[PDB]
Design a binder for this molecule. Structure first.
Ligand SMILES: COC1=C2C[C@@H](C)C[C@H](OC)[C@H](O)[C@@H](C)/C=C(\C)[C@H](OC(N)=O)[C@@H](OC)/C=C\C=C(/C)C(=O)NC(=CC1=O)C2=O
Length: 214
């Protein structure tokens, strides 16, 4: 319940500020980036399990799941991958990405397409193309479930999770969509973005759709 507050390394702050404010036209690339991250996390729990099969037991099903939450203007991207500990959330989302953000920012200033962001290993931050706030909710086998929260400002919070559904293992990216990016809540649009940029994914991609019965 009591949150802890941390400062972003200056370079990450710089990268986020640029992305949340950019008028780049191909914002849909965020979904490919987050699906790729989900796939990586799943690769890692699968590989870890080769020599430690009990690691799968916390969530035997390996999947990527996409859930639009229209009333809240939220889009969730979930995986049952390896997940992240508290220390991992703090270090990797707040500091380790710093250098990668610098080289990528230099490439941007030179004319690189924002879509290159994954090749510089900082594609997580592409979520700010469509969202002005994010909660990363994560459960590693090695720690409790935690919430990392950022609004692209210079600081982020980490809080022990006593408010969200239990995930057996893995991560939820909960995107709070900008008012002009609500198209990414629609089933039709989501399918077309997946089919276009994520053709070769080794894991099931599940879409959770809410429909009124008549
Ligand atoms: C190859 O590893 C990747 C790294 C190196 C490093 C951070 C990996 C991380 O180390 C603790 C875990 O091993 C890994 C399993 C966790 C994820 C991929 C998370 O995604 C999900 N769904 O768990 C991702 O998002 C919340 C966290 C950070 C992503 C960043 C900063 C990024 O921008 N791009 C990156 C994409 C990557 O694939 C990246 O830096």
């Amino acid at each position: 319940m009591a949150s802890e507050t941390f400062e972003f390394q200056a370079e990450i702050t710089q990268l986020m500020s640029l992305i949340i404010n950019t008028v780049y036209s191909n914002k849909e690339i965020f979904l490919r980036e987050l699906i790729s991250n989900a796939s990586d996390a799943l690769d890692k729990i699968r590989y870890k399990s080769l020599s430690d099969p009990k690691q799968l037991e916390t969530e035997p099903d390996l999947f990527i799941r996409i859930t639009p939450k229209p009333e809240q203007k939220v889009l969730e991207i979930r995986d049952s991958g390896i997940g992240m500990t508290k220390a991992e959330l703090i270090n990797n989302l707040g500091t380790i990405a710093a250098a990668g953000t610098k080289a990528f920012m230099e490439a941007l200033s030179a004319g690189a397409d924002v879509s290159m962001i994954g090749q510089f290993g900082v594609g997580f931050y592409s979520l700010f193309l469509v969202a002005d706030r994010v909660q990363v909710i994560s459960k590693s086998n090695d720690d409790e479930q935690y919430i990392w929260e950022s609004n692209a400002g210079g600081s982020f919070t980490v809080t022990l999770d006593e408010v969200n559904e239990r995930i057996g293992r893995g991560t939820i990216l909960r995107l709070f969509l900008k008012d002009d990016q609500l198209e990414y809540l629609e089933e039709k649009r989501i399918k077309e973005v997946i089919k276009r940029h994520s053709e070769f994914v080794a894991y099931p991609i599940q879409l959770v759709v809410t429909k009124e019965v008549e």
